[PDB]
Design a binder for this molecule. Structure first.
Ligand SMILES: OC[C@@H]1[C@@H](O)[C@H](O)[C@H](O)c2nccn21
Ligand SMILES: [Ca+2]
Ligand SMILES: [Ca+2]
Ligand code: NA
Length: 434
């Protein structure tokens, strides 16, 4: 019997609503639910929650037509969410989760307050960029005082702002946000090696690399996405060029086959020598990026490596050794990157193969991560049953349930031709209001 995709979408929505109910019951206004114990935890600042999962969920709720739930969350934000807080926040996470989550909710709803709050937060984060003579953000900033800490940063944490900041520039009319984000990316791109790679670790004050390791995953992932995404969102010609150049350098110097499968281990950014044997599950986003930038055959080949892991292990291991294709770790983070790739590749040609693969992933999530009050990360994927930890990461609310729903629902609330997703799956273009 052919899969009824619409029924599967309805199941995703049902499960999401059920999870939301658990969040409301156990963790209202708190950063994350621990759905086994039925408790909450903080994410950014211990004891000073910022409604993380609520904010992350908003655009997902809207897309699913969970309008009452969406509005309850928006109304909570409008009444309660403030960033005048004497505590340190990680700049990267704060941007991709809270600035981006408020922006997608703003674009869905039109509510000016959500933009006001996104912009307030971005202005607090801007102090981290201003504290570097290179415009490379420090990793942490005090939201109230602007004090910075930890300049030993990385490509992802200096280069995952341009989508949110660029949308802020579009909406506000102030180019400063776009410029600040682009300047940081240009810094490292200008320091590419002769073979076109960047090391993944960089110092905000010296502006120099602090390792020799080029990476597509750990320390770097979304830098490469945001180059393409800035072309797509803003028509930025430099970013279009850079996106393709960076990917072609990776395909030339980091693509390696082991036991017939494509992997992208870390390499020395100048010599191209392999410097590591680990690949993170997190790398799976890159299969989708490869398609986006016009390297779809390679993207499908890379997806196939992860499809192998899913078929073999059920849940994709958090990290594997590329030389053996086996797990390096037994726990998971309830990770979304496989359906991320499936959606991104499916948006190119609408091949139902990607739906089939994502349906496996969704069903496996249901079979392994369901707990009393929501969905949880795993302790051990090698036991049967797989043992659970007790945490629903904030990104679950923005990412995989949205990916599944977008893959299966064909919702009229999204213009699929105009759809743009941040690295946290915040929708930054493509809402079709009712
Ligand atoms: O696993 C999802 C999380 C999210 O915060 C987001 O997708 C982000 O791009 C990322 N990089 C590595 C891990 N993650
Ligand atoms: Ca991502
Ligand atoms: Ca992407
Ligand atoms: Na979101």
């Amino acid at each position: 019997t052919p899969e009824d995709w619409k029924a599967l979408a309805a199941d995703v929505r049902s499960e999401f609503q059920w999870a939301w109910q658990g969040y409301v019951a156990k963790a209202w206004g708190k950063d994350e639910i621990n759905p086994v114990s039925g408790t909450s935890r903080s994410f950014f600042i211990e004891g000073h929650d910022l409604g993380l999962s609520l904010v992350e969920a908003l655009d997902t709720l809207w897309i699913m037509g969970l309008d009452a739930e969406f509005q309850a969350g928006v109304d909570w934000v409008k009444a309660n969410l403030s960033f005048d807080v004497d505590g340190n926040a990680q700049v990267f996470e704060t941007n991709i989760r809270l600035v981006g989550g408020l922006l997608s909710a703003h674009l869905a709803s039109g509510d000016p307050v959500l933009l006001a709050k996104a912009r307030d937060l971005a202005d607090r984060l801007a102090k981290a960029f201003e504290a570097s003579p290179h415009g490379l953000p420090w990793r942490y900033v005090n939201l109230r005082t602007g004090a910075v800490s930890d300049p030993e940063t990385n490509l992802a944490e200096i280069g995952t702002y341009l989508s949110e900041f660029g949308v802020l520039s579009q909406l506000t009319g102030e180019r400063k946000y776009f410029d600040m984000a682009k300047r940081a990316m240009r810094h490292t791109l200008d320091r590419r090696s002769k073979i076109g790679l960047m090391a993944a670790n960089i110092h905000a004050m010296t502006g120099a690399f602090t390792s020799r390791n080029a990476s597509i995953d750990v320390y770097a992932d979304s830098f490469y996405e945001y180059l393409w995404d800035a072309w797509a969102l803003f028509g930025d010609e430099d970013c279009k060029r850079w996106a393709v150049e960076c990917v072609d350098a990776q395909l030339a110097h980091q693509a390696k086959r082991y036991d017939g499968r494509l992997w992208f281990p870390m390499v020395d950014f100048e010599t191209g020598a392999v410097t590591g044997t680990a690949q993170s599950e997190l790398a799976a986003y890159y299969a989708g990026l490869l398609g986006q930038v016009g390297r779809k055959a390679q993207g499908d080949d890379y997806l196939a490596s992860f499809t192998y892991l899913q078929a073999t292990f059920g849940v994709i291991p958090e990290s594997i050794d590329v030389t053996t294709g086996q797990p390096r770790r037994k726990h998971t983070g309830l990770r979304p990157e496989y359906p991320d790739a499936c959606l991104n590749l499916w948006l190119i040609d609408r091949d139902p193969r990607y739906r089939r693969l994502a349906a496996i992933h969704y069903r496996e999530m249901k079979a392994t991560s369901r707990a009393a009050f929501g969905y949880t990360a795993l302790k051990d994927i090698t036991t049967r049953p797989m043992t659970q930890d007790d945490n629903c990461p904030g990104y679950w609310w923005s990412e995989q349930m949205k990916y599944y729903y977008l893959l299966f629902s064909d919702t009229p609330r999204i213009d699929y031709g105009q759809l743009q997703l941040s690295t946290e799956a915040n929708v930054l273009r493509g809402f079709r209001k009712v």
